Symmetry: D2
Subunit: 118 residues, 4 copies
């Protein structure tokens, strides 16, 4: 299922546990200790039984004991099981800004995760 270690297309490492209560918990590394960050999120713990994927999302605030970028990324997507399981996401990365700079505060993109290094 969702619980496990995943890698995006750029080599980031997503170590996640999907709990019985719909919770996602774990760590995100965008490969050393000072690049590891806490993540939390939620997933559909009772997905449809018609072949559909499992909706999920999570957040990382880019502060740890070593760095603080004053920013946070959310990933929104779905887990697709099968022979090569995949989590397909789109993401929003918002930085803290002044009001005058808020129009350019948010980047957008897409990440795909597999259980194998790219």
């Amino acid at each position: 299922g969702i619980t496990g270690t995943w890698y995006n297309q750029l080599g980031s490492t997503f170590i996640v546990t999907a709990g019985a209560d719909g919770a996602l918990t774990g760590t995100y590394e965008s490969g050393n200790a000072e690049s590891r960050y806490v993540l939390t999120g939620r997933y559909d713990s009772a997905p449809a039984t018609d072949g559909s994927g499992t909706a999920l999302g999570w957040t990382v605030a880019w502060k740890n004991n070593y760095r603080n970028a004053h920013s946070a990324t959310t990933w929104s997507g779905q887990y697709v099981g099968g022979a090569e399981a995949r989590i397909n996401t789109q993401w929003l990365l918002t930085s803290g800004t002044t009001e005058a700079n808020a129009w350019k505060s948010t980047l957008v993109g897409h990440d795909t995760f597999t259980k194998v290094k790219p």
Copy 2:
């Protein structure tokens, strides 16, 4: 300044606690238990003190003990303090779909939250 009850522009209520460890926890509703959902997220617990906002994000999966939309929303944004404090966000709402329908799986929008409804 984040902990408390917040209201978006469409009548939803966002009840959140910002913990010392950077955690966001709480509930999201659009007023009975049937419409209330768990949320979890993260925020910058050491923001700049130069007028910049506080970056944050959270997720709701749209399942509770009564309903399940097989979907989840993530909000990404910043808290802005002051006399009219706000949480300004953009959001992504992904539904569980088949592969053939995955191209249309994700809605995008924006929500602004205030401390008074």
Copy 3:
């Protein structure tokens, strides 16, 4: 109707003509970013919208190059026109810069602009 001069919430000026064939043409002047004076825009709109109270779907693009500056970037606005006593165009936008492959992951900004014929 869509044809007219519009302003967003940040002071940008959007001067547009909606042609009978579905074409949007005109100029955009931005109050933010690496921008000066007017830039060409082109786009499309639904020339036969639904009659059930729905807005009119539309979109347009500005490449941020003119005779004065070139930011090596382009914005697309996607949205709908909503008529009424306070006519409005509500949009969400994507702004992509030309980048190297190593920097492409952070090539695209996203936001939302609302346009009115009265300048806020």
Copy 4:
């Protein structure tokens, strides 16, 4: 510029575009089979003087989903960059806005990504 010609996305769609000397994109967006009912006008803009440091070329375009045969009351904008070479690509993110009532406007806009190649 390398942009003019026929491009194919990952899901069976095709577009033929001309990149004008002035920065104009004009052409037609269609399905793989190419029947008349699947063809729509496309219009956009690109950076006609891109950087020379290995960066991509920023561009965008719009298709309103109305033709002489059908009308979905919606429009898509693609925002992205062209990357040249033997394996040329246009890498995009897109926004698809439908005309809606105010009460349904919150769910009016879909978001995704498309990659285009010169080979089907």
